[PDB]
Structure formats: C-alpha cells, structure tokens
Amino acid sequence: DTLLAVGNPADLAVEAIRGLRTSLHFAMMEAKNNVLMISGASPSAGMTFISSNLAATIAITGKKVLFIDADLRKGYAHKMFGHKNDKGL
Amino acid sequence: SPSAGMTFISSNLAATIAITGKKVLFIDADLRKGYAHKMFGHKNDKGLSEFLSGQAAAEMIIDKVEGGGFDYIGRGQIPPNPAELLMHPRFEQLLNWASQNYDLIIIDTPPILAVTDAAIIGRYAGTCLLVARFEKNTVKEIDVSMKRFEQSGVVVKGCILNGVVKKASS
Amino acid sequence: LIVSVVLVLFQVFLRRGIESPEQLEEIGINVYASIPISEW
Amino acid sequence: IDLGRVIGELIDHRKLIISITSVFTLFAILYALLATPIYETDALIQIEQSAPETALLQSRMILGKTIDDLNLQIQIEQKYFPVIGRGLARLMGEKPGNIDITRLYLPDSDDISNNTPSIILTVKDKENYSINSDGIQLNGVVGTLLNEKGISLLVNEIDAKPGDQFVITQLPRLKAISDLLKSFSVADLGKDTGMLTLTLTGDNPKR
Amino acid sequence: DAKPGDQFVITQLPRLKAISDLLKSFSVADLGKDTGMLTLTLTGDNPKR
Ligand SMILES: Nc1ncnc2c1ncn2[C@@H]1O[C@H](COP(=O)(O)OP(=O)(O)O)[C@@H](O)[C@H]1O
Ligand SMILES: Nc1ncnc2c1ncn2[C@@H]1O[C@H](COP(=O)(O)OP(=O)(O)O)[C@@H](O)[C@H]1O
Ligand SMILES: [Mg+2]
Ligand SMILES: [Mg+2]
C-alpha cells in the first residue's frame, strides 16, 4: 500500500512511467491549462496506479504537483498515501 | 537494445573526425553502464554526474584522450537518479557552453527501449542517429524506437547498421 | 542430408533480424552506413 | 521465393550441413562395420500338397527333436564387455573361440522372472577353467566331469586363448524352440511341385 | 497356498456362464484353408491353467 515510485524507484515500471513523463512534457504543451485527467474503460485497469506514480515521478523533478482523487465511489488514495480522512473532496 | 554499438560507433567516429584537424568533444551520457573512461585512460574523479549534481565545475570534467585528439567527459560515479539528473538545466548550460568552444559534440546515450535518458537528451541534440545491430535487432524494434523518439519530440535523422558480415544469400 | 536440410529450413524460417539496409529503407529510414565486423 | 535464396542459404550453412551429414555417415559406417554378420543356409526337399508339410515342418515336435539331438538348449556366448567388442575383435582379425559342451545342468533357481540359469566360465589355460554362478568360484578341468553344488557340467575341446570368458546359459526348451523357429523359414517356390526350399539364418556358418 | 490373512471370493457361477466365458477367449483357425492343420488359441491370466 505504498507508491512503487517511492519504495522501488529503480523498477522497470517506474522507468516506463518516466518515459511517459517525458512524452507528456512535450504533448502537454500548448494546452489550454495544466490539468491532466487519467481515465479508463473498465475498473481495475490502472488509473490510480498510473496517476499516482506519474505524480510522484513528476514531483521528484522539482515541480509542484497536485493529485486529486475524483473517484468519489471507490477511491482509496488516502489509504495509499497516509491520511487525515476528514474533509475530502 | 544494449550491446548494439553506440559506444563503439560514437568513439571511433569522434576519433576519425578529430584526426582531420577539427576539435571534437565526446560526452558519455550513459550514466548507468558507461565505460568510456576505461577505454580512454582515465582520471575517474569528477565525471558527468559530479557536474550535474552541482559538486563540480565545467573545467575539471574534461580530459584528453592519449592516442585520440578529442576531449571527453566520462560519466563518473553512478548516481541513484540518472534520468532525474539529466533534466537539470545545468546539462543544457554545459552543452551551450561546449558548443561555442568545439567544432563537434558527440553524445553517447543508453538505449531507448530500456530507459528514457536518450529522449531527455535528444531535445538539445542537433542531429540524432540510431544504431541497429545486424542480426540481433529487428525492423519492428527500430520502428518502435523511431516512434518513441517522435512522441518525446526528438526527430531522428536516420539509422546506422552495424556488425555487418558477408552473406552469400544477399 | 534430409535432417540438415530441414534444420536449415527451420533456422531460415525462424530468423527475424535485419539482413540488409533495404528492409530499413522500405519503412522510410535512411541507413547512413553499414559498419562491418572488425576481427581485430 | 526463388532458387537464388535457397542456394545462398545452403552455401551459408554449408558447415552445419557437412558436419551433420558427416556424423550421420560415420555412425552408419560404424554400425555397418560392427554389426555381427548373419549367414544364410538353405536346402531343397522333394515331396513325393506341400501346405500341410509346410505347417508340419515348423511344428514343435520336429524342432524339439532336433534341439534334443543337437543340444541347442545350451547357449554359449563369447564375452566382450562393451556393445562393440565383438565387432572390433572381428575387425582386428582375432579368431573367435569355441567350447564343445555335451552335458549341462544348473541348480535351476527359477525365480519369478529369470527362468534361465546362467554361469560364467573363465579360461585359465588349454585344460582347466574357472566357474562362477553368483560369485562362487570353482575350478574345473576339461575331460573329467564336474558335479558340485547342484551343478553338473562336462567340457570337451575348449579352443580359445587363456583369459577368455564365456556366458553359459541353460535356456528352457520352449525358448530354444522359439528362437530356432524365429529364423527358420519354408517356401514352396512352385505352389504345386514337390520342391520345398528351407532357409535358416544364423551367425555361425557351420552350426 | 497363501499367507494367513488373505481373502478369496468363491463364486459358483452357472454352467452356461462358464461355457460362455471359456468360449469368449477360445479361438480356432485353419491357417491353410485346405490342410488338416488347425491352430487352437486360448488366452487367459493363469499360465498353467
Ligand atoms: N503495472 C502494474 N503493476 C503492478 N500492479 C499494478 C499495475 N497497475 C495497476 N496495478 C495494481 O492492480 C490494482 C488495480 O489498479 P488501480 O488503478 O488501483 O484500480 P482502478 O484502475 O480501478 O482505479 C491495483 O492494486 C494496482 O496496484
Ligand atoms: N563493428 C564492430 N566490430 C567489432 N566489435 C564491435 C563492433 N561494434 C561494437 N563492437 C564491440 O562489441 C561490444 C558492444 O559495443 P558497445 O557500443 O561498447 O556497447 P553498447 O552498444 O551497449 O553501448 C563492444 O565491446 C564493441 O567493442
Ligand atoms: Mg481508481
Ligand atoms: Mg554504451
């Protein structure tokens, strides 16, 4: 229940996510604002895994990152991050 | 893929361009398994890592090859965060400073199917060339590498076959 | 002879690596050189 | 595809093709030069029909009478340790020896599977020899009969160099009959004549 | 002839059933189609019986 990008920063998956970060740094240019939305087709696909790890890998480069868990139905980001569960979204 | 010939081709090309009277700089940006300093004769202190992390200046990193004629900058100590180091603006400062004092700068990089260092560096590279092993690599792997460089914003000029042998079936 | 021929056929039909810059030039990739192996 | 591709591939893999063909040919040469030769003898019988006689020739009665006459139930094998010792011994010009045995009777252990008792006879000289059944060593001499430990044995005219060893097996009568019948064949060759061709194949040209 | 503690099922099957069982595994052939030779074959699990 801890971030892969923190427990094992040298894993293959985190390398692939760093590749995704470098792709995004060019794709996310000329966008109307700096908001990224990771979604999916079916549950248990990897939206939270990808989103959280990507946020970690972009935060480690000195850029401030905000992570919103708008999964108001079965979200568990506070469980994986260490939480004060009061006053959520 | 690794063990394709990036270091072999890059070092030999740097030598062959240095022997024609043009100053050449050779940067070994393979911060994970680079051994250029082993092949050139080394003062392994103050590599590229020690400059990127900020604990060294731009002058103690550059060394002279003995039987070459071109300068080089070894990787140095293996860092724990290579891809996160390469994003530092000091790397671009180093390249901009070197481009005004040398006629050619050749950067060796790790593979792109394995890590993402090559695609981070490729933003400041004027020209980029892939190296394809003769029998090992495939057309699919080279196409995937080209597209992965395209996604990250790096335009690859072309390929360089390597390890060619004479086959009667040709 | 038969086993040698079938083994050679299997090896030929199981190879996938590049064999000539023509394959890379079909896709639209300019092969700038072809460095031979150095026995030295 | 085209012929040029296949010719080029063959030329490229010439080394592998040659190596595999050479090793297979070497194995074939070894087998064809080490396999025990099998000679064939034949005879011609005039019948004064021929189908009932063809069936009766291979009956157990006649073959059993022949085996009882010639003592074919005493199997004698020259011993070579490997699976190729006999072939190389024949190739080297070594003369195979032989022992004439007229009387053999083993204790007939007759366990669940091994119904064929066997002993090992080692040649010590032209006259005496050693016998071992299950490690029990005994000394015998050609001529005088041996009757010891439930083993009766008679040896005549042993012809081999000293130090040779021979496996002596007393296989059952039915097994000997089956072995004889397996290599023995009869044909009519005319389908109406009294001529019958009898064929027998074996490794001993005189036996 | 058995070790003590062994058990055996002894069945008195009818004569017709025994005849059918014997006939099922018993075969006859001519092998010459004209000779007086007949080959009789019997298959069973007891080598002496
Ligand atoms: N590449 C991956 N490797 C290992 N585990 C993964 C990977 N991607 C997702 N998961 C794990 O499988 C589970 C489902 O992913 P998750 O994103 O949390 O659910 P959802 O897609 O419905 O939001 C999670 O427990 C996650 O840790
Ligand atoms: N044309 C070649 N002829 C002979 N050796 C070569 C050739 N190309 C590469 N090599 C050798 O094979 C090894 C792999 O090449 P290298 O570039 O050093 O690794 P990598 O591609 O992973 O950076 C090296 O030891 C190199 O000397
Ligand atoms: Mg989720
Ligand atoms: Mg290298």
- Given a contact cutoff of 8 angstroms between Cβ atoms, the answer to whether D185 and D42 are in contact is no
- Given a contact cutoff of 8 angstroms between Cβ atoms, the answer to whether B166 and C19 are in contact is no
- Chain D residues 3-22 with CB within 8 Å of chain C: 9-10, 13, 16-17, 20-21
The rounded distance, in Å, linking the Cα atoms of B38 and D176 is 79
Does ligand 2 come within 6 angstroms of the Cβ of B1?
no
CA distance A68 to chain B (A): 24
**Radius of gyration of chain D, Cα coordinates, nearest whole angstrom:** 24
- Chain D residue at shortest CA distance from E37: D52
Other beta carbons less than 10 A from residue B72's beta carbon: 25
Q: Which of D17, D22, D25 is the mutation pick for testing C, counting most C CBs within 10 A?
A: D17
**Radius of gyration of chain B, Cα coordinates, nearest whole angstrom:** 16
- Given a contact cutoff of 8 angstroms between Cβ atoms, the answer to whether D136 and D150 are in contact is no
**Is B133 within any annotated ligand binding site?**
yes
Contact residues for A77 (Cβ-Cβ < 8 A; gap 6+): A48, A52, A67, A69, A71
The rounded distance, in Å, linking the Cα atoms of B62 and B36 is 13
D96-130: b or e for each residue (b if 16 or more CB lie within 10 Å)?
Answer: eebbebeebebeeeeeeeeeebebebebeeeeebe
Solving technique for this entry? cryo-EM
- Given a contact cutoff of 8 angstroms between Cβ atoms, the answer to whether D127 and D155 are in contact is no
**Radius of gyration of chain A, Cα coordinates, nearest whole angstrom:** 14
Other beta carbons less than 10 A from residue B91's beta carbon: 20
Contact residues for B27 (Cβ-Cβ < 8 A; gap 6+): B48, B72, B73, B105, B106, B107, B108
The rounded distance, in Å, linking the Cα atoms of D107 and D151 is 6
- Chain C residue at shortest CA distance from D15: C4
C-beta atoms of A60 and B84 within 8 A: yes
C-beta atoms of C18 and B165 within 8 A: no
- Chain D residue at shortest CA distance from C4: D17
| Diameter over CA atoms, chain C | 41
Angle, CA of D46, D49 and D54, to the nearest 5°: 70
C-beta atoms of D21 and C1 within 8 A: yes
CA distance C20 to chain D (A): 14
Q: How deeply is C19 buried, as exposed, middle or buried, from its count of CB atoms within 10 A (0-12, 13-18, 19+)?
A: middle
Phi-psi region of D50 (alpha: psi -120 to 50; beta: other; left: phi over 0): left
**Is C36 within any annotated ligand binding site?**
yes
DSSP character string of D78-109:
E--SSSSHHHHHHHTTPPPPEEEEEEEE----
To test the pocket of ligand 2, the residue of B7, B113, B130, B162 to mutate (highest count of ligand atoms within 8 Å of its CB) is B7
To test the pocket of ligand 2, the residue of B3, B27, B32, B40 to mutate (highest count of ligand atoms within 8 Å of its CB) is B3
Measured in Å, residue A13 CA sits from the centre of ligand 1 at 12
Chains near D with 3+ CB pairs less than 8 A apart are B, C, E
Interface of C with B (CB under 8 A): 15-21, 23-24, 27, 29-37
**Hey, is B53 helix, strand or coil?**
coil
DSSP annotation of E24 reads H
The rounded distance, in Å, linking the Cα atoms of A3 and A49 is 8
Nearest of A21, A79, A74 to residue A50 by alpha carbon? A21
**Is A23 within any annotated ligand binding site?**
no
Contacts of B136 in chain C (CB under 8 A): 17
Contact residues for B6 (Cβ-Cβ < 8 A; gap 6+): B30, B108, B109, B111, B131
B4-42: b or e for each residue (b if 16 or more CB lie within 10 Å)?
Answer: bbbbbbbbebbbebbeeeeebbbbbbbbbebebbeebee
* Atom number, ligand 2, closest to the C-alpha of residue B4: 21
Measure the CA dihedral D16/D17/D22/D24, to 10°: 100
Instruction: Give start and end residues of each alpha helix (H) in B41-88.
Output: 48-52, 82-85
A88 to chain B, any CB pair closer than 8 A? The answer is no
- Given a contact cutoff of 8 angstroms between Cβ atoms, the answer to whether B72 and B28 are in contact is yes
Resolution in A: 2.9
Give the phi and the psi of residue D102 in degrees, each rounded to 5.
-110, -15
The rounded distance, in Å, linking the Cα atoms of B96 and B58 is 12
**Is B35 within any annotated ligand binding site?**
yes
Contact residues for E33 (Cβ-Cβ < 8 A; gap 6+): none
- Which CA distances in Å does D29 have to B120, C5, D39, D181? 65, 21, 20, 31
- Chain E residue at shortest CA distance from D50: E35
The rounded distance, in Å, linking the Cα atoms of B103 and D148 is 105
**Is A2 within any annotated ligand binding site?**
no
Asked whether at least 3 C-beta pairs link E and D within 8 Å, the reply is yes
C-beta atoms of D12 and B170 within 8 A: no
State the count of interchain CB pairs (< 8 A) between B and D. 11
C-beta atoms of D11 and B170 within 8 A: no
Token digits for B12? 């030999």
C-beta atoms of D55 and E35 within 8 A: yes
The rounded distance, in Å, linking the Cα atoms of B38 and B40 is 6
Measured in Å, residue A25 CA sits from the centre of ligand 2 at 33
End-to-end CA distance of chain C: 36
